[PDB]
Design a protein around this ligand. Structure first.
Ligand SMILES: Cc1cc(OCCCc2c(C(=O)NS(=O)(=O)c3ccccc3)[nH]c3ccccc23)cc(C)c1Cl
Length: 142
C-alpha cells in the first residue's frame, strides 16, 4: 500500500465532487474541513485568475482532462514547496470541478482528482512526508 496516496486521493476526490455536486481516518475528516474553509477562500480570491486559467484551458470532455497533467506539473512545481500552493492546486481543481458539472460532464471529476493527487504526491512526496502529510496540512491551517 501507499497510504499517503490513497489518503490524498480520498480527500481531493471528495472535496472536488462535493464542490461540484453542491454537497456532500479522523485525519482525513479534519483535512477535509480545513480544505473547505481554506479552499473556498482561495477560490474566491483568485477567481479572476482562476477564470482566466479555466477559459484558457478550455475543458470540454474527458480527453481534455487527461491532457491537463503536464501543464499542471508546469504551473505547480517552482521548487519552493509550501502548503499555500498545494491548497491552491486543490482549490483550482474544485473550481474546474464545478465548471465540469455546469457543462454536464461530472464523469470527468474523478479523473481530474486522480490527476491532481497524481501530480501532487509524485512531485512533492519527500516534502509531504517531512511535514507529516495531512496532519501537517490540518495543523498548518489551524
Ligand atoms: C487542477 C489544476 C491545478 C493547478 O494548480 C496550479 C498551481 C496553483 C495555482 C497558482 C499559484 O500557485 N499561484 S502563486 O504562485 O501566486 C501562489 C503560491 C502559493 C500560495 C498562493 C499562491 N496560480 C494559479 C492560477 C490559475 C490556476 C491554478 C493556480 C494548475 C492546472 C493546470 C490544473 Cl488543471
Amino acid at each position: 500500500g501507499d497510504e499517503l496516496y490513497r489518503q490524498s486521493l480520498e480527500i481531493i476526490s471528495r472535496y472536488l465532487r462535493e464542490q461540484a455536486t453542491g454537497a456532500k481516518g479522523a485525519t482525513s475528516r479534519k483535512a477535509l474541513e480545513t480544505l473547505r474553509r481554506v479552499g473556498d477562500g482561495v477560490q474566491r480570491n483568485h477567481e479572476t485568475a482562476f477564470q482566466g486559467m479555466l477559459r484558457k484551458l478550455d475543458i470540454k470532455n474527458e480527453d481534455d482532462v487527461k491532457s491537463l497533467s503536464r501543464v499542471m506539473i508546469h504551473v505547480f512545481s517552482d521548487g519552493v514547496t509550501n502548503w499555500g500552493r498545494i491548497v491552491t492546486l486543490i482549490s483550482f481543481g474544485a473550481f474546474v470541478a464545478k465548471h465540469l458539472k455546469t457543462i454536464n460532464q461530472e464523469s470527468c471529476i474523478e479523473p481530474l482528482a486522480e490527476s491532481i493527487t497524481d501530480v501532487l504526491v509524485r512531485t512533492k512526496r519527500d516534502w509531504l512526508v517531512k511535514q507529516r502529510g495531512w496532519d501537517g496540512f490540518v495543523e498548518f491551517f489551524h
